[PDB]
mmCIF file of C-alpha atoms in Angstrom:
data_model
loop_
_atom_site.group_PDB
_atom_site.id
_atom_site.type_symbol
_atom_site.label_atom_id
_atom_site.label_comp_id
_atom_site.label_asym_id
_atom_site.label_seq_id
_atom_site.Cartn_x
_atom_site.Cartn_y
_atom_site.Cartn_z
ATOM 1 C CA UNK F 1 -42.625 61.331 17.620
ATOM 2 C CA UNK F 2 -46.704 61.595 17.208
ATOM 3 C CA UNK F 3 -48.280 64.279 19.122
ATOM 4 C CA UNK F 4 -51.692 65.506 19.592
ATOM 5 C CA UNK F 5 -51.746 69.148 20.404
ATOM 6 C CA UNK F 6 -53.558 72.253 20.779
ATOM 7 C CA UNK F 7 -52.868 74.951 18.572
ATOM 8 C CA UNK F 8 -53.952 78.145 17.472
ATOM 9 C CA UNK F 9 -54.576 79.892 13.864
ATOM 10 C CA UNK F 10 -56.565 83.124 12.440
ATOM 11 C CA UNK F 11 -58.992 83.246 9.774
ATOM 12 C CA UNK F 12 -59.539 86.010 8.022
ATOM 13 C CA UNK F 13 -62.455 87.018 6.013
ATOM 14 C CA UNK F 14 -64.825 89.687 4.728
ATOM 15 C CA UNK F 15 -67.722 89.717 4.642
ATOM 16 C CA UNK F 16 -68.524 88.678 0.783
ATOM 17 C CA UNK F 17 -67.266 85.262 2.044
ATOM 18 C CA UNK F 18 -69.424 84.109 4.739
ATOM 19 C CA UNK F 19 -70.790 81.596 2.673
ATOM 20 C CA UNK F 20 -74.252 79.945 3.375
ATOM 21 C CA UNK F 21 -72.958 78.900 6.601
ATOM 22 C CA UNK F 22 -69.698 81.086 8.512
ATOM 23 C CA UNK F 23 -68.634 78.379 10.789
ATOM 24 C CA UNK F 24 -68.388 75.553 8.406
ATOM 25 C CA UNK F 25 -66.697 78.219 5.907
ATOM 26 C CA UNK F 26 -64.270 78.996 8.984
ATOM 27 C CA UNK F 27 -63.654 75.425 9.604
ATOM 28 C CA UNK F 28 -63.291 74.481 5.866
ATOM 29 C CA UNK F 29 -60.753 77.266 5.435
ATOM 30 C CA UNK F 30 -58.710 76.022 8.823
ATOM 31 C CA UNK F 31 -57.933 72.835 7.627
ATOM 32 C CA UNK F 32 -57.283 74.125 3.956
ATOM 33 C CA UNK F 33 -54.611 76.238 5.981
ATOM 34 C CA UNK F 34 -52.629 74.322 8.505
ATOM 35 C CA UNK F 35 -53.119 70.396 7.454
ATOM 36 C CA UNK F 36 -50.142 69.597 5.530
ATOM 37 C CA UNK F 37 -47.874 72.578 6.742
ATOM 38 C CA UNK F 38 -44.957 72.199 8.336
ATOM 39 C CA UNK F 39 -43.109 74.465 11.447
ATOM 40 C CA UNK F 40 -39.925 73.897 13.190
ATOM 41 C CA UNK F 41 -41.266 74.601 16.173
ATOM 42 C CA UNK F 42 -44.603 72.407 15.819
ATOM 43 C CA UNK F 43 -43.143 69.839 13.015
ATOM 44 C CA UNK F 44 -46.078 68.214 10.342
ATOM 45 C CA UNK F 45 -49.405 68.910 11.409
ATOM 46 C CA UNK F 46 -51.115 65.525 10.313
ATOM 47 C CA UNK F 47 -54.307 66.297 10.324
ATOM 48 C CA UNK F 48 -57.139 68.605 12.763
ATOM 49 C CA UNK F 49 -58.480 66.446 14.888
ATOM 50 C CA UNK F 50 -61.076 69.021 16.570
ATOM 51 C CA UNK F 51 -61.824 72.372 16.706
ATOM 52 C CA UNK F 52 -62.506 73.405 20.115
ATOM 53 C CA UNK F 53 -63.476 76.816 19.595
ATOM 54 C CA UNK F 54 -64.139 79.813 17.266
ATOM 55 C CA UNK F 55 -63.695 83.226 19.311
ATOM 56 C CA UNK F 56 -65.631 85.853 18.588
ATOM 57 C CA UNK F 57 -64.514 87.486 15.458
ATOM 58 C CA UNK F 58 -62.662 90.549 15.469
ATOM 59 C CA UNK F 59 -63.597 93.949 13.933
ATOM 60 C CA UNK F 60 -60.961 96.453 14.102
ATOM 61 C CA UNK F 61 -61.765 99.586 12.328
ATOM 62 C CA UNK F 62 -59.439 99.696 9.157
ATOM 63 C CA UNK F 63 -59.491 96.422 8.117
ATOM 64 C CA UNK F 64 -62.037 95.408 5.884
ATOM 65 C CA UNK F 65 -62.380 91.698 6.633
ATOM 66 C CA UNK F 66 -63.085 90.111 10.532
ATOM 67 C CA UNK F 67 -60.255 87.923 11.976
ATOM 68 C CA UNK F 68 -61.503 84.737 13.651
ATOM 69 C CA UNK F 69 -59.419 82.994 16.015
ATOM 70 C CA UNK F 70 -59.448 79.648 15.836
ATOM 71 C CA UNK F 71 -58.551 76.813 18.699
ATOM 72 C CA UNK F 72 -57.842 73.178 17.672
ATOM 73 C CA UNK F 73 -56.514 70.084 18.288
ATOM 74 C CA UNK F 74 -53.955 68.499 15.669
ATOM 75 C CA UNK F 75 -52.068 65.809 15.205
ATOM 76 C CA UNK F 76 -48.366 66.672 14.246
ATOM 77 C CA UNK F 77 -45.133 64.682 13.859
ATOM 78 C CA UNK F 78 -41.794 66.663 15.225
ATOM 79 C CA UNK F 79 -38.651 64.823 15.344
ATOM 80 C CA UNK F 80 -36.087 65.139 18.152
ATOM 81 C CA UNK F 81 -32.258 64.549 18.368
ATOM 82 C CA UNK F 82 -31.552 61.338 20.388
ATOM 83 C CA UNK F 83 -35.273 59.664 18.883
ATOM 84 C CA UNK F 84 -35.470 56.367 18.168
ATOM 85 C CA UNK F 85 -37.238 55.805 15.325
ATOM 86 C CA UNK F 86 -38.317 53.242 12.358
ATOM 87 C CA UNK F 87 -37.999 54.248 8.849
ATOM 88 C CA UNK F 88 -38.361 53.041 5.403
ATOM 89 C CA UNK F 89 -35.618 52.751 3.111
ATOM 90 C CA UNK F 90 -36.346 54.636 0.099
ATOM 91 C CA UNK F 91 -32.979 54.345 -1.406
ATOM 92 C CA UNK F 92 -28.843 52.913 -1.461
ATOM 93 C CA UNK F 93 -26.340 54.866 -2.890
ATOM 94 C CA UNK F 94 -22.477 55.017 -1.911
ATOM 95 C CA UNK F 95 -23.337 57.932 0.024
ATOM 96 C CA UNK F 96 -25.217 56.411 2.205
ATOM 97 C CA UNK F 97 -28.585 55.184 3.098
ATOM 98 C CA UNK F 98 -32.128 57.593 2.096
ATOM 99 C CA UNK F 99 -35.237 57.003 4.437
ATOM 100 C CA UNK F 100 -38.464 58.428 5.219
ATOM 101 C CA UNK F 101 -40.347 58.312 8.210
ATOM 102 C CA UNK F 102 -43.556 59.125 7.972
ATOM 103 C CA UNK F 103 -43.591 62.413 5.694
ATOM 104 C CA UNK F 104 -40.149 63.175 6.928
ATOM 105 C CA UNK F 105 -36.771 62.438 4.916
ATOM 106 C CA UNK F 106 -34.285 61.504 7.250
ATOM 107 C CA UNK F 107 -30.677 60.778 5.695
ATOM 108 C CA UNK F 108 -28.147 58.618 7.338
ATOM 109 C CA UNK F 109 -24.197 59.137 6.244
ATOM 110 C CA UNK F 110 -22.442 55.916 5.156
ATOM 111 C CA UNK F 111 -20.078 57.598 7.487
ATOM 112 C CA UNK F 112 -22.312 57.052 10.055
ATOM 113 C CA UNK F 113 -23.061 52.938 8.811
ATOM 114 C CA UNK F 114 -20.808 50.182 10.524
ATOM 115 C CA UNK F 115 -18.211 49.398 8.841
ATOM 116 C CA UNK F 116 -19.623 45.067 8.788
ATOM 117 C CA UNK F 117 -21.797 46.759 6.130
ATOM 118 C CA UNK F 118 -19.761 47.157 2.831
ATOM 119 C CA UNK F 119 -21.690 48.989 0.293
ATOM 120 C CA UNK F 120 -22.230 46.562 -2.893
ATOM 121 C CA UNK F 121 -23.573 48.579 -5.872
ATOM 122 C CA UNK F 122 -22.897 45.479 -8.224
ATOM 123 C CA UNK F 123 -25.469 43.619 -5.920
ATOM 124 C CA UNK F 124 -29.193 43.638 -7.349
ATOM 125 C CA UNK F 125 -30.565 46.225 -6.266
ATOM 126 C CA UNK F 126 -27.812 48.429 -4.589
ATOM 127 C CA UNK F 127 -27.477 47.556 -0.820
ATOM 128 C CA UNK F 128 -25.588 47.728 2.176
ATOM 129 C CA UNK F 129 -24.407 43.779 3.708
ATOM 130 C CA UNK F 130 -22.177 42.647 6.082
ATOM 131 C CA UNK F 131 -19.355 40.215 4.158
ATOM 132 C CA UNK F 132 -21.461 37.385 5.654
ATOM 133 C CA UNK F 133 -24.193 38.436 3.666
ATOM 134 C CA UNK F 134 -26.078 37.582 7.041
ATOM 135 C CA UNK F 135 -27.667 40.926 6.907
ATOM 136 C CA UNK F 136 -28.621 42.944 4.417
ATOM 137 C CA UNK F 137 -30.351 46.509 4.189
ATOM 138 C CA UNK F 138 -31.708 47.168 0.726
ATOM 139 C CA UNK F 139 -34.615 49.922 -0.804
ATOM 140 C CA UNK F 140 -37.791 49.387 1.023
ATOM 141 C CA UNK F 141 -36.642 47.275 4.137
ATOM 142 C CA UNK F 142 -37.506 48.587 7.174
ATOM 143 C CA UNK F 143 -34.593 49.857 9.731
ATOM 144 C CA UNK F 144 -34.744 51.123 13.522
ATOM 145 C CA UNK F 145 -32.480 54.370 13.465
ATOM 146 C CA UNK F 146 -31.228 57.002 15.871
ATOM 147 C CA UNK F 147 -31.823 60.449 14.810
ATOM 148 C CA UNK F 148 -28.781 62.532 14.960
ATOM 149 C CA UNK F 149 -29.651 66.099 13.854
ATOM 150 C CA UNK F 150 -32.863 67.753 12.441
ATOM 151 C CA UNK F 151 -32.785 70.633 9.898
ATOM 152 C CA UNK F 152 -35.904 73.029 8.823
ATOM 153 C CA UNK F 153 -35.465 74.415 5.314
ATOM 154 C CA UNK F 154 -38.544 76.129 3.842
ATOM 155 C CA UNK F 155 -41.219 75.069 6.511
ATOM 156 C CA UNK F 156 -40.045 72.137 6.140
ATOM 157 C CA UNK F 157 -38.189 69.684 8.711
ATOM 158 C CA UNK F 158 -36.183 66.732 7.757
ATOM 159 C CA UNK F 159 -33.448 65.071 9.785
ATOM 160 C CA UNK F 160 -30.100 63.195 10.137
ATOM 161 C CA UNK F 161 -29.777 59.656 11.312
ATOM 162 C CA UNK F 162 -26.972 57.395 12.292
ATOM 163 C CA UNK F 163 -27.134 53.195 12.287
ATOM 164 C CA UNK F 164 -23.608 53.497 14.859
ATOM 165 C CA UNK F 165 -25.533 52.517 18.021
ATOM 166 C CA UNK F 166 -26.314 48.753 19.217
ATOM 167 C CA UNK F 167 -29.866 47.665 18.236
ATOM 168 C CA UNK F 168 -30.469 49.678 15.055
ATOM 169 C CA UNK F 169 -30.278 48.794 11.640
ATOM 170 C CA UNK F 170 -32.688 45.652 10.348
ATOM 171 C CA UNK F 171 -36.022 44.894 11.294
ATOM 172 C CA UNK L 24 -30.744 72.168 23.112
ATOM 173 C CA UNK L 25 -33.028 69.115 23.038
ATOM 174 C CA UNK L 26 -32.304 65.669 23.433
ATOM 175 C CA UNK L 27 -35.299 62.805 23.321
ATOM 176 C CA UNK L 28 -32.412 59.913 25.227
ATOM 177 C CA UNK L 29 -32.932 62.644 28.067
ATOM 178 C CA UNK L 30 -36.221 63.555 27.496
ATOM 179 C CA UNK L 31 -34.882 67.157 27.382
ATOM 180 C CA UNK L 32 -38.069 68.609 25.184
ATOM 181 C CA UNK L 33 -38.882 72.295 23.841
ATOM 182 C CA UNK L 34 -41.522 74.173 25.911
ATOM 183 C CA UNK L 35 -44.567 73.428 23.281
ATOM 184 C CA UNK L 36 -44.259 69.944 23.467
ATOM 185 C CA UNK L 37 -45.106 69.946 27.270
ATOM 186 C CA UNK L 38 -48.576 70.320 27.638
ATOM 187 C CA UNK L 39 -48.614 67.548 24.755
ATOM 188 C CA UNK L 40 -49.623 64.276 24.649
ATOM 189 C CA UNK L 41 -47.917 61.527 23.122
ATOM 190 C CA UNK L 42 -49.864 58.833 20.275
ATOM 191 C CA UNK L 43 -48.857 54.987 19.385
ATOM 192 C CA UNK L 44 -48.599 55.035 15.360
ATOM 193 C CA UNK L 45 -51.450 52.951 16.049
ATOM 194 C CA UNK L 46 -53.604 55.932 17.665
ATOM 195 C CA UNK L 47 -52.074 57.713 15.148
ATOM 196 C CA UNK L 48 -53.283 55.411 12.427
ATOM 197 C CA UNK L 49 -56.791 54.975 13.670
ATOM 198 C CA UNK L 50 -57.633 58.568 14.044
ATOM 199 C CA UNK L 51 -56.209 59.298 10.384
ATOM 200 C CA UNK L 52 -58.974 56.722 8.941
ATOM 201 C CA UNK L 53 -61.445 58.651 10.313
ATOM 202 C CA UNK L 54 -60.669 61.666 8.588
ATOM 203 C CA UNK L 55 -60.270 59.672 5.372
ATOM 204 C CA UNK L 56 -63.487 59.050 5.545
ATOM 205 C CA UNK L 57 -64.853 62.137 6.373
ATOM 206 C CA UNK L 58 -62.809 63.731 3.086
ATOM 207 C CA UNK L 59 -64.001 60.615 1.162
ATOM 208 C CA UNK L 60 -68.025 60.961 2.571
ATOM 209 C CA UNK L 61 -69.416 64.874 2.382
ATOM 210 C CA UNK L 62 -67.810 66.413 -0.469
ATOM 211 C CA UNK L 63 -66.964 69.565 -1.739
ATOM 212 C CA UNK L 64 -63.252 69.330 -0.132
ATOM 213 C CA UNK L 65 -60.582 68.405 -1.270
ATOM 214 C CA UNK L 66 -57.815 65.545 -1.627
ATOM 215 C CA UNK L 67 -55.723 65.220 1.572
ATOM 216 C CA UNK L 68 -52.271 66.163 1.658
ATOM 217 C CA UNK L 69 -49.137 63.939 0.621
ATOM 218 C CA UNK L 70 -48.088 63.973 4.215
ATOM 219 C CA UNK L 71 -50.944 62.737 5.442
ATOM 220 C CA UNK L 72 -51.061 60.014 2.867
ATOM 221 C CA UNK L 73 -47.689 59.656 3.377
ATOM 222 C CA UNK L 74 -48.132 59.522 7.668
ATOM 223 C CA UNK L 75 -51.351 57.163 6.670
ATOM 224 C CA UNK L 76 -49.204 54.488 5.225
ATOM 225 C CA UNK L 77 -45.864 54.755 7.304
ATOM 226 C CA UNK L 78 -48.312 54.893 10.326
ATOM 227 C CA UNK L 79 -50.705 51.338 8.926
ATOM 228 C CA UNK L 80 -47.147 49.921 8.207
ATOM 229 C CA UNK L 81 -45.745 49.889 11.361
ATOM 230 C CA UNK L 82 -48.917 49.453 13.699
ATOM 231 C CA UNK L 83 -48.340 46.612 15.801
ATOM 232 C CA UNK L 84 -51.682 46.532 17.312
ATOM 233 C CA UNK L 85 -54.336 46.381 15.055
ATOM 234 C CA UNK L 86 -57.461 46.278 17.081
ATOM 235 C CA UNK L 87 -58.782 49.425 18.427
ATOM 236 C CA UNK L 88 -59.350 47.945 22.094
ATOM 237 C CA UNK L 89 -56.081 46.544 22.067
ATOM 238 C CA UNK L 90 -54.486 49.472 21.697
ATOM 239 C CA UNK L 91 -56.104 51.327 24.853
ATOM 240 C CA UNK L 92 -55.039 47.866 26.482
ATOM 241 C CA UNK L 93 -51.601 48.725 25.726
ATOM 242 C CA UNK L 94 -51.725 52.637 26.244
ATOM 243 C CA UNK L 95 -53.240 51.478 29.887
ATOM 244 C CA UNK L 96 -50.975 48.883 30.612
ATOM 245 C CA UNK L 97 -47.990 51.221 30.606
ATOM 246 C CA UNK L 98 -50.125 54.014 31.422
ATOM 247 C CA UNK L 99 -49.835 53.071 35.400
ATOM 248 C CA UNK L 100 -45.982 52.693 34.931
ATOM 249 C CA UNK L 101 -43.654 55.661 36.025
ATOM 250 C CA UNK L 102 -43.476 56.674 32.598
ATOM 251 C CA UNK L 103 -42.569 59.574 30.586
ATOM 252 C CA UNK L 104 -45.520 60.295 27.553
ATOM 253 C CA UNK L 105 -42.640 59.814 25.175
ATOM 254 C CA UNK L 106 -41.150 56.601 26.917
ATOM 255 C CA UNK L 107 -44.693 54.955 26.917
ATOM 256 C CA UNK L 108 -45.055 56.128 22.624
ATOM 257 C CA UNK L 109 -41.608 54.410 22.556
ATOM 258 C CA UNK L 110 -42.079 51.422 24.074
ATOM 259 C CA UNK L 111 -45.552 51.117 22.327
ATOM 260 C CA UNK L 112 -44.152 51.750 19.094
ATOM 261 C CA UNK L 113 -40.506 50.044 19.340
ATOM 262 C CA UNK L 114 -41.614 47.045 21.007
ATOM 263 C CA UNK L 115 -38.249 46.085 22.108
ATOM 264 C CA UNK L 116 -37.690 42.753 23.644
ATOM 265 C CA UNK L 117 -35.006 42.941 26.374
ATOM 266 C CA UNK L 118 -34.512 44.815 28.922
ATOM 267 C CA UNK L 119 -31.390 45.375 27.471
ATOM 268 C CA UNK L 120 -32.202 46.308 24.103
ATOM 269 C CA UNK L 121 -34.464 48.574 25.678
ATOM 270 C CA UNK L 122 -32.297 50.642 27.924
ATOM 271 C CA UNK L 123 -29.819 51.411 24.688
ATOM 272 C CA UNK L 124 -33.156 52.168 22.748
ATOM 273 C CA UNK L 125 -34.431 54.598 25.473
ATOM 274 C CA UNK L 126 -31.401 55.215 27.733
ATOM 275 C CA UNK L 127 -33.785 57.453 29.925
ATOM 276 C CA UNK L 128 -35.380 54.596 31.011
ATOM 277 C CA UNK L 129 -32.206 53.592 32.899
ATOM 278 C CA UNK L 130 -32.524 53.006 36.661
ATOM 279 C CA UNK L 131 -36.098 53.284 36.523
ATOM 280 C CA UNK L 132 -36.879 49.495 37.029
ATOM 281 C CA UNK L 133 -35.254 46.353 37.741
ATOM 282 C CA UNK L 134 -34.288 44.215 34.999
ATOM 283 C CA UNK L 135 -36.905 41.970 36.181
ATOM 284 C CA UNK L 136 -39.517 44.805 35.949
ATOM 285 C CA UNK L 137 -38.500 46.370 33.046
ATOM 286 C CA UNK L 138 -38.584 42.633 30.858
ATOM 287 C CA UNK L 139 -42.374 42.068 32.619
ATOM 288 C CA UNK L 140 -43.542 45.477 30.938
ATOM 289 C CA UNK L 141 -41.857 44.400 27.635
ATOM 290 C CA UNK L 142 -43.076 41.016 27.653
ATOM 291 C CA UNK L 143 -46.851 42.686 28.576
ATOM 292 C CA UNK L 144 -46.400 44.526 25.436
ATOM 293 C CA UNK L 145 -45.417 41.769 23.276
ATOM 294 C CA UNK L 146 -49.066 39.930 24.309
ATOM 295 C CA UNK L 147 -50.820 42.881 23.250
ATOM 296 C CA UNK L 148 -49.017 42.764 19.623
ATOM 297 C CA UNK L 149 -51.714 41.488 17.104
ATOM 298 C CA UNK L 150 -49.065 39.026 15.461
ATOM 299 C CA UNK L 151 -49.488 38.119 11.313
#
């Protein structure tokens, strides 16, 4: 799910690095920072929408360089057991079926396919069909899935989905 | 601990707000072409290129006061941020469909309700 949110974040700096201008170098080092990070408990911040406001910086006697907190609005993606969501399909393999949602992998277990779709790797390209060929799943086709687990490894979230439930699958 | 088919949420995501891909799509243009315009920054991230696309490639409406149309429409409806996103973003076409989809949106509305909301939405779609 999309969400636009406020969050926080400190910039530090000395002096030496004020640049012409300190609030433009403050912004220009917040979005170098947080755009394209990832936190379990925040998910993908997008992109910083606005920065609502700089605090005054800080100036505690031992450190060298001024910490300037930073208020902001972002837009992140977190993903949330029991989500309905539509992702891409980035690749078939007997193992099951590789997606991405956005910039999140999500994987779903051929254990966790219907069994009307039999995996055919003679086909084409690779894909997953019912007997009836009436439907077919295949690399880049577009499927509604249910997410079933998410993990965070390194920053970084990704998730578990399952096609078992009634309206999923092809789009 | 959480669970979106209950709308059981983490704390942080409470004071949140919810955005259609579409939202989600606009406001990413715009800070393409702030990086693109004024240089002396540089190249956005893979995930936003990545959210960019995913985000274009699934926007069902197109048109910038559509979407508010849309975002309003459900807006007034006894709906949870998330459902609304959902519904926005899923565009389901039963009433049916759409209970399994969202299953918190069970007992919420009559059948007959529920189908006028996802019929609303389907006007709203900017077909191609």
């Amino acid at each position: 799910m999309f969400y636009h949110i406020s969050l926080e974040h400190e910039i530090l700096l000395h002096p030496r690095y004020f640049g012409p201008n300190l609030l433009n170098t403050v912004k220009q080092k917040l979005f170098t920072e947080v755009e394209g990070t990832c936190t379990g408990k925040y998910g993908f911040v997008i992109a910083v929408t606005t920065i609502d406001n700089i605090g005054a910086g800080v100036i505690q006697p031992g450190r060298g360089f001024v910490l300037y907190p930073v208020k902001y609005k972002a837009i992140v993606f977190r993903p949330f057991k029991g989500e309905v969501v539509d992702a891409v399909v980035t690749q078939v393999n007997k193992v099951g079926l590789f997606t991405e949602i956005g910039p999140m992998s999500c994987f779903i277990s051929r254990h966790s396919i219907p069994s009307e779709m039999e995996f055919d790797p003679n086909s084409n390209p690779p894909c997953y069909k019912t007997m009836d060929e009436d439907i077919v799943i295949q690399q880049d086709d577009e499927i509604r899935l249910k997410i079933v687990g998410t993990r965070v490894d390194k920053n970084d979230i990704f998730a578990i989905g399952s096609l078992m439930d009634d309206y999923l699958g092809l789009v | 601990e959480e669970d979106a088919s209950q709308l059981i949420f983490p704390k942080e995501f409470e004071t949140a707000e919810t955005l259609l891909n579409s939202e989600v799509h606009m406001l990413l243009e715009h800070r393409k072409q702030q990086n693109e315009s004024a240089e002396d920054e540089q190249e956005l991230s893979e995930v936003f290129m990545k959210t960019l696309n995913y985000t274009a490639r699934f926007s069902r409406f197109k048109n910038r006061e559509t979407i508010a149309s849309v975002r309003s429409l459900l807006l007034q409806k006894k709906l949870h941020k998330f459902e609304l996103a959902c519904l926005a973003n899923l565009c389901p076409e039963t009433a049916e469909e759409s209970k399994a989809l969202i299953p918190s949106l069970e007992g919420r509305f009559e059948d007959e309700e529920l189908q006028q909301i996802l019929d609303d939405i389907q006007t709203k779609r900017s077909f191609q």
